Amino acid sequence: GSQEQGMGMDLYATSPVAKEVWDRADKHFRENYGFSIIDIVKNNPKELTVHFGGPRGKIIRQNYMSMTFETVNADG
Amino acid sequence: SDTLGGMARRTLQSKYEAYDAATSVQRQILCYCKDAKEIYYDVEP
């Protein structure tokens, strides 16, 4: 609820510590889910799309595919 | 934002009015954003 655009980005620039945190995070997200949370935070997109391109791209949609979700029937 | 801050301030008014005044408890509510410098112990001479 308190998420404001560009939050804690000022601190990003001024702290070599906080910097590396966001980095390791982004590094992850980009290479695994194919987007950057830093971008999403800096400039808030009303829309954003990922792309399952070459070698490194096929491995991403793999994760999107390997997303499991549980709901049982009314008969068990 | 200071969401939990004005939340913990409000629990100090509705319940803790007498407890703090009696016990002599000093209370200091600091949000990251607003109360920035008092966290990092940065003051000028």
| Residue of A2, A3, A4, A7 to mutate, interface with B, max B Cβ within 10 Å | A2
Q: Residues 6 or more apart from A34 whose CB is under 8 A from it?
A: A50, A51, A52, A57, A60
Q: Which residues of chain A have a CB within 8 Å of the CB of B1?
A: 2, 4
Question: Which residues in chain B are closer than 8 Å to A4, comparing Cβ atoms?
Answer: 1
Resolution as reported, in Å:
3.1
Collect all residues of chain B within an 8 Å Cβ-Cβ radius of residue A1: 3
Tell me the helix, strand and coil percentages in chain A, rounded to 5.
55, 0, 45
Count of helices and strands (H, E) across chain A: 4, 0
Experimental method: X-ray
The residue of chain B nearest to residue A8, with distances taken between CA atoms, is B33
Q: Is B1 on the interface with A (CB under 8 A)?
A: yes
Q: Are B1 and B7 in contact (CB under 8 A)?
A: no
Rounding to the nearest 10 degrees, give the CA dihedral for residues A64, A68, A71, A73: 100
d(CA A34, CA A53): 10
